[PDB]
Amino acid sequence: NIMYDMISDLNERSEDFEKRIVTLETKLETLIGSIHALP
Amino acid sequence: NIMYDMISDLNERSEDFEKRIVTLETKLETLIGSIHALP
Amino acid sequence: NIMYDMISDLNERSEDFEKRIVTLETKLETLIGSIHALP
């Protein structure tokens, strides 16, 4: 089904986001911890 | 409808992203402002 | 089709994310490079 093809794309799309988002969030907080913490 | 279940999941998925994205963006610019601004 | 309207919204939604995500990622790594690199 065409609609399903679309839905499935979005899920692959969406999944990719979840990772990218987690990564960014970690780096961020980390760099912030890497600053606050020690010099 | 199964397809709708899928579509609705994606919206919940997608909504979650919008928040996470806004938050990250704020922290970022902020930390950048917290650097440029004063020491 | 209502379902399609929904699917299309999500794609516009999803597309918007991809940009916002790329931008954030660049700023991040950049600020990190702007720190490591020189003072």
Side-chain angles (χ1 to χ4, degrees), chain B residues 3-32:
Chain B
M3 296 282 273
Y4 185 59
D5 290 338
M6 290 189 225
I7 289 164
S8 77
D9 174 54
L10 292 175
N11 302 312
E12 210 183 67
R13 215 99 70 70
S14 308
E15 257 307 303
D16 165 54
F17 290 177
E18 271 137 292
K19 279 111 71 171
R20 282 208 264 173
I21 303 303
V22 187
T23 305
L24 280 179
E25 297 172 306
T26 303
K27 300 179 182 176
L28 204 174
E29 59 185 5
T30 302
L31 163 58
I32 297 188

Side-chain angles (χ1 to χ4, degrees), chain A residues 1-8, chain B residues 3 7, chain C residues 1 3-4 7:
Chain A
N1 181 20
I2 289 293
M3 296 282 273
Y4 185 59
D5 290 338
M6 290 189 225
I7 289 164
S8 77
Chain B
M3 296 282 273
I7 289 164
Chain C
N1 181 20
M3 296 282 273
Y4 185 59
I7 289 164

